[PDB]
Amino acid sequence: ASNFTQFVLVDNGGTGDVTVAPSNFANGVAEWISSNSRSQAYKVTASVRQSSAQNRKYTIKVEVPKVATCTELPVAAWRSYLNMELTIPIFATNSDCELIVKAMQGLLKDGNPIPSAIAANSGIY
Amino acid sequence: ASNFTQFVLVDNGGTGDVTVAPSNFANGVAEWISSNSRSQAYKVTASVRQSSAQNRKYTIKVEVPKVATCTLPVAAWRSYLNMELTIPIFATNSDCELIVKAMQGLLKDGNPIPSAIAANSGI
Amino acid sequence: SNFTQFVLVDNGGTGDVTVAPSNFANGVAEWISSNSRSQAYKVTASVRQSSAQNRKYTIKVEVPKVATCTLPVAAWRSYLNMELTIPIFATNSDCELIVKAMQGLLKDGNPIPSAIAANSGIY
């Protein structure tokens, strides 16, 4: 409803950034898109439900391609898929949810072990 | 390796930070905990798999249980969590940097999804 | 805290069929009469955010009919659905009115329940 606006999906500090405008909200799943192109655009999906007697299950997906001219018609060489889940108590206080989103913002920081084990093409340990 | 190091998880920019020390590595699941009280402190689990010729599938779990005294300290509730990350193998360093850049860009405070999480009503 | 028990059928006394909660997982509720799967009634419910701004409740009911023959056997089950779609910015009065629309539609002498109980067709 009030959280269905366009937003920056990859930040390059200016011109090189990419935004996504909302496209659909149907059958329970949201959808943000970068451009109407079906094979050159990022993608964000999300929903919400009530998993258990006390736990909502926020699920979120991303899809990030990389395209090249490849002559001429640019095409999606590959799609770095992604998933996410977040099981949050129904009556969990607002402060606790801020803390959880802070935990994500901290786990994937600039130089943490997990972004390092992604960038360096390696595995963990 | 040098990726198995204690790292700040909930960084409140100073006094309110949280550090999880590395604790275990069995069957590939590198496991950080926060304190000796496993039933009272945070947890992070991470692992990688490549059971194909094109797809490296990561997987990360976090558990952030709120603490509370009881009529005795035990975990009132644990906000569980999952994650996955499928990356094509022939993707270079830059493109994986870009996927992680998507992660920072998704969960920043000025974005819809973290606001929806912090404002539980359905997006 | 609306995940409680209730009387689904009132037989004018002690012949009432009651159901109590039995499960709530994978976004699917469940009430049950008795643990015998091939014997009990069944209520299932969920909730989603299907359209742009529309909360779409769905409610299923299953009321099998039994008869001992030689040994209770589910002779046939009268399945059922319900898809109640309510826009999000709805007050309490309008939801009261929707529930009263349900109550009025399926009353005693109304054409639709009379059609059901006479096993005929409309008009």
Add this chain to the structure above:
Amino acid sequence: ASNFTQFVLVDNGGTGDVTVAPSNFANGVAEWISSNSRSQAYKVTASVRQSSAQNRKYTIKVEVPKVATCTLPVAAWRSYLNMELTIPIFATNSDCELIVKAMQGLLKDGNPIPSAIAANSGI
């Protein structure tokens, strides 16, 4: 016919009721209408069908718009509803009375399901 009458779709205990009125029948799809205007009126649509073998399946839609006038009467937000009621062919009078009583019991005034619908929350 004999079951194509007008009923009180929303009984407000007196003068506040919404008396629908039969208006149409095409393709085996009955249709009541509240007010002659086709943009501010309730609408009930009850059809029956019978696959050749074992099941008679009904269908009942109820549309409950909330009116507004702030320039000009127009449907502010339609609150639709759907329904199905699958019944085996040889279900006699008693079993049809029982399933209609299943409806008359589930949607009572104090059951969990009507309250959950009237609160706009999770079940």
